[PDB]
């Protein structure tokens, strides 16, 4: 709840909170009400909302099966040229190789 | 590209579901007596009911009266 | 089944209704049938008044409700045809809501055992007591209709459309109840699964209205509610239902898609939809042509169709070559009702020769500019280029006729300022000239350029 | 079908501009006014109409005068625009024909004119048919009709309708339907009386383009919104006007129709916010939602723990506890101590079953506690919080009416029995 406040900053993300978003601020709505006042009757709403979200979310992830950069995050394409070494590969006594 | 006043819009709803509904049902419940502002015998509306009865049972009791049977 | 109907009212009804209720007892239940029909010939054919009645309303109500514990059915509908003709005031119906037949038209609500001739006096019972009083609407009574209108149409249900016939109607009075249990959320994915178009748009004409009065704007959330319905868009992988069927999989899709097709051109014709959705922040119709430039086959040949009847255009039939397309959708076009049998000339004089207003106002033109001036500042004509260029030719067509209709529409209606720099087309232009992309973009650029000299 | 077909026929005859048609087709058309069929005479009226709009037609009609009182609203808008010229403008004075309407038109018709234009754009675009691109053109309204002569002027200004809508438009109230309704119906009274250059002159004084421009970019209601921007749009017909609006940020065409290739070195009515988002500002307001025994689960099983009545229960929220006052009720009696523990039992069970995480487990738990003890389910304590959960609480269609039907077949001697006797 506290990383999806900040906002999505991409499509994926965005269209994510733009299916999900208002069941889950609202179970969280619930939850709170609940740890305020200590009665079971608020949390059951809350929990029958996470579990609706994890059938609906289930059903459709082994069709995951591949991504394209531009849907997924937009920053890693538009780079063409850095200053990094390939990640792992570096040696005190041969020049770099830049990605 | 007006629609406001909740008049027209209840309008809209009614004509919508009573023409384009494939059962009657809902048209059979969309009648228009409700009033709101000739209540005559009826408002001619006149009907009683009609049929031939008695008590089958419940889904669930099969379920009730087959495990009672089994658990005996 | 008694008719005698000159003697004293208060002990007519007091000798029917001691009879009716039988100590439970000793009475068969059609004779009961027969004891309510003759109770609703009374109530219609007598003044209703305490004074002439002889009794208060507490009394009837309790002698009434009794009749909804015995096991007929039918005894249920003749009470709700009774009850229907009580509620007559406010002061009545309230009387009558303290009293806890709630929960009874609750269960009777919800029993689906073959027994279509009940639920329907309790539905028009529902609509009698909203219509004179819904402000003081039970909550019992929102929840079971919510509850059926949720999950009635997997179930076969025949009266969900009914319900939602009622909770929108309901909605008008009392936003709050519907809110607080939640039911706004359930007409918008109603909205997916409906796909008759008149009832698609009336059911989002409530939700839009809704988002007018500044009191009705309190109730909605910000962004989580209107911009759901273009969720099978901006989704690559949608899945609407937990519970599906294995057997069909793609037409679920394209029903998915009619329907939320429709009900984006249903949004854009009111003004809250516009205002709504093309908020200075992140709305959805920024998503909405984001989108447009990801290299999905489908997605892309999705969306066209959107453009092409938000703006009324006509469509091409899909075709690998452009010339024909062109010709497919000439405004020359013959017609079959210009045949001698049909319109023989006067529909077809209508089409081809112009009008005859010189400075009358056409106010569709001056929408259709307010429209297109929306687009525009979003920057469409970007990933309408990013289409043409990167995409198959089936597509490409598409794009490049929306394109060249488009454009024609703008030095056509569009004032001058924001009409004299579009047509300068800077981005295709650039990519036309560059001597360092690879080929293919150049030449399938330059080919979709005399595509739009020949089509001008 | 030949009546139809050889009068709608004549559009044919319009539109293709034929040689003096104003001579001989206006007169058969005015014959044909007269037919049996009012669909026919519908659409004569409709061709009629359309070919009006040319200036030596209109004077070729007014050579002759008949008359379409007999007929509906559709004639009524047909002769009222005869009011463009004086030269007919004499004629129609000498029976007081202008104080007649004009009257009628503030107090009633001018609330009609947005409702009968509202229904061709809804026709229109929306789908609605009232019990491809069509083609909307805003009705003839009398007050821009006197406004064209110069004298008309005159003819208005003894009643000062300018100051009511004016006042209207500094102070509306926007708060229900009807203030909206005169409030759009003035809205475009105002935009048809700035549409000649003399009207320009008689609605300058008050300054109330700003009060419009103030309105279409910091309003409330959106529907107030569109009409905003249509009778702007209105106001820019004349260069003057337009001269008016571009000192604001807003554009406008400044050719007319006639041919659809204009140079830019009497127009038709067009306004544009320079940015288009400018009038998208819309205020947000926050949203409105600002405002024991399960933990014995562990070790005190059913088998073992076997061997008010309710946790919450009170003297209200029971369906007999209520009627004991206004009916004078017996107070509830109270039998056999081995069943609250179950109470509390069934009802811990339902309410963990609220969250239907493994409904059929739970489901099967109060079947087991049903059938083992059948004749427990007549309390009515239980039934009315059983009725209040599911009048709060969130339930799938197939545990609600389960839950609703395992209190199907119960009897209640208590009440029934009670309330006989206090009937009488």
């Known amino acids: 709840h506290a990383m999806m406040e900040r906002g999505p900053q991409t499509l994926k993300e965005t269209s994510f909170n733009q299916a999900y978003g208002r069941d889950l601020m609202e179970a969280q709505e619930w939850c709170r009400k609940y740890m305020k006042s200590g009665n079971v009757k608020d949390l059951t709403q809350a929990w029958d909302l996470y579990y609706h979200v994890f059938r609906r979310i289930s059903k459709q992830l082994p069709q995951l099966t591949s991504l394209e950069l531009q849907y997924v995050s937009p920053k890693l394409l538009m780079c063409r040229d850095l200053e990094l070494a390939v990640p792992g590969t570096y040696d005190p006594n041969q020049p770099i190789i830049r990605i | 590209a007006f629609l406001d006043n909740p008049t027209i819009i209840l309008a809209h709803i009614r004509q919508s579901h009573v023409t384009s509904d494939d059962t009657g049902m809902c048209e059979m419940v969309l009648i228009d007596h409700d009033v709101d502002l000739y209540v005559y015998a009826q408002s001619v509306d006149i009907t009683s009911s009609w049929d031939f009865g008695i008590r089958r049972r419940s889904n669930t009791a099969q379920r009730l009266e087959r495990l009672r049977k089994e658990r005996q | ?456 | 079908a030949c009546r139809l077909y050889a009068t709608k026929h004549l559009r044919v005859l319009l539109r293709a501009n034929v040689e003096f048609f104003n001579n001989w087709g206006i007169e058969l058309l005015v014959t044909q006014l007269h037919d049996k069929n009012k669909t026919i005479s519908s659409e004569a009226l409709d061709i009629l109409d359309e070919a009006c709009e040319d200036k030596a037609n209109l004077h070729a009609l007014i050579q002759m005068k008949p008359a379409l009182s007999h007929l509906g609203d559709k004639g009524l808008l047909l002769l009222l625009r005869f009011l463009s010229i004086p030269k007919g403008f004499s004629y129609l004075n000498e029976r007081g024909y202008v104080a007649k309407q004009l009257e009628k038109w503030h107090r009633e018709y001018n609330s009609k004119y947005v409702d009968l234009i509202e229904e061709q754009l809804n026709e229109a675009l929306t789908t609605y048919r009232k019990p491809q691109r069509p083609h909307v053109y805003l009705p003839i309204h009398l007050y821009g009709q006197l406004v064209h002569h110069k004298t008309g002027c005159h003819l208005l200004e003894v009643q000062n309708i300018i100051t009511e809508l004016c006042r209207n438009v500094r102070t509306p109230d926007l708060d229900k339907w009807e203030e909206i309704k005169k409030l759009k119906a003035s809205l475009w009274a105002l935009g048809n009386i700035g549409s000649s250059n003399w009207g320009l002159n008689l609605l300058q004084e008050e300054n109330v383009i700003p009060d419009i421009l103030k309105l279409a970019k910091q309003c409330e209601v959106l529907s107030i919104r569109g009409t905003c921007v249509y009778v702007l749009g209105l106001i820019a017909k004349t260069k003057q006007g337009c001269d008016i609006l571009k000192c604001h940020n807003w554009d406008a065409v400044r050719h007319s129709r006639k041919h659809l290739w204009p140079v830019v070195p009497d127009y038709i009515g067009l306004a544009l916010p320079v940015d288009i988002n400018d009038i998208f500002q819309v205020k947000d307001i926050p949203y409105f939602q600002t405002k024991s025994f399960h933990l014995l689960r562990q070790q005190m099983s059913l088998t073992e723990i076997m061997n008010t009545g309710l946790q919450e229960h009170t003297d209200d929220n029971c369906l007999y506890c209520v009627c004991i006052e206004i009916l004078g009720f017996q107070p509830s009696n109270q039998l056999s101590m081995c069943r609250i523990l179950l109470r509390k039992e069934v009802l811990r069970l339902v309410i963990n079953l609220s969250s239907s995480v493994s409904t059929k487990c739970h489901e099967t738990g109060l079947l087991t506690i049903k059938e083992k003890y059948p004749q427990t389910f007549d309390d009515i304590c239980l039934y009315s919080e059983v009725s209040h959960l599911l009048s709060h609480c969130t339930f799938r269609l197939p545990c609600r009416r389960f839950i609703q039907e395992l209190f199907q077949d119960v009897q209640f001697l208590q009440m029934h029995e009670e309330a006989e006797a206090v009937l009488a």
């Open chain 3, 1 to 456: 089944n008694v008719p005698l109907d000159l003697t004293r009212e208060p002990s007519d009804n007091l000798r029917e209704i001691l009879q009716n209720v039988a100590r439970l007892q000793g009475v068969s239940n059609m004779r009961k049938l027969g004891h309510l029909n003759n109770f609703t010939k009374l109530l219609c054919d007598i003044g209703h008044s305490e004074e002439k009645l002889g009794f208060h309303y507490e009394d009837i109500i309790i002698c009434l409700r009794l009749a909804l514990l015995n096991e007929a059915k039918e005894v249920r509908a003749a009470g709700l045809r009774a009850l229907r003709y009580l509620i007559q005031d406010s002061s009545i119906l309230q009387k009558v809501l303290k009293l806890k037949v709630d929960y009874l038209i609750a269960r009777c609500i919800d029993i689906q055992q073959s027994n279509e001739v009940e639920r329907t006096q309790a539905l028009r019972l529902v609509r009698k007591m909203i219509t004179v009083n819904a402000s003081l609407f039970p909550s019992s009574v929102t929840n079971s209709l919510i509850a059926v209108g949720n999950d009635g149409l997997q179930e076969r249900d025949r009266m969900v459309r009914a319900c939602i016939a009622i909770i929108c109607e309901l909605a008008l009075q009392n936003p709050e109840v519907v809110a607080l249990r939640g039911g706004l959320n359930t007409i918008l994915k109603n909205v997916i699964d409906c796909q008759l178009s008149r009832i698609n748009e009336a059911l989002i004409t409530t939700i839009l209205h809704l988002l007018n009065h500044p009191k009705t704007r309190q109730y909605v959330r910000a962004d989580v509610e209107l911009e759901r319905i273009l969720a099978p868009y901006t989704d690559f992988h949608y899945r609407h239902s937990p519970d599906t069927a294995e057997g069909q999989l793609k037409e679920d899709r394209e029903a998915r898609f009619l329907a939320s097709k429709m009900g984006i051109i249903a949004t854009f014709r009111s003004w809250a939809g516009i205002i709504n959705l093309c908020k200075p922040g992140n709305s959805g119709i920024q998503s909405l042509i984001g989108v447009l430039c990801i290299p999905n086959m489908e997605i892309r040949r999705g969306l066209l169709e959107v453009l092409y009847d938000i703006f009324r255009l006509p469509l091409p039939v899909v075709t690998e070559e452009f010339i024909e397309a062109l010709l497919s959708v000439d405004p020359g076009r013959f017609q079959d009702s210009w045949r001698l049998s049909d319109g023989f000339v006067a529909a077809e004089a209508k089409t081809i020769l112009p009008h005859r207003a010189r400075s009358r106002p056409d106010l569709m033109d001056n929408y259709l500019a307010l429209i297109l001036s929306a687009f525009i500042r979003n920057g469409l004509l970007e990933g309408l280029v990013e289409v043409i260029t990167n995409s198959d030719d089936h597509i490409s067509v598409r794009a490049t006729i929306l394109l060249g209709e488009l454009l024609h529409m703008a030095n056509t209606i569009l004032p001058h300022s924001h009409s004299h720099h579009l047509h300068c087309l800077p981005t295709l232009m650039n990519m036309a000239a560059s001597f360092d992309i690879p080929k293919e973009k150049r030449l399938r650029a330059s080919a979709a350029l005399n595509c739009l000299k020949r089509f001008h």
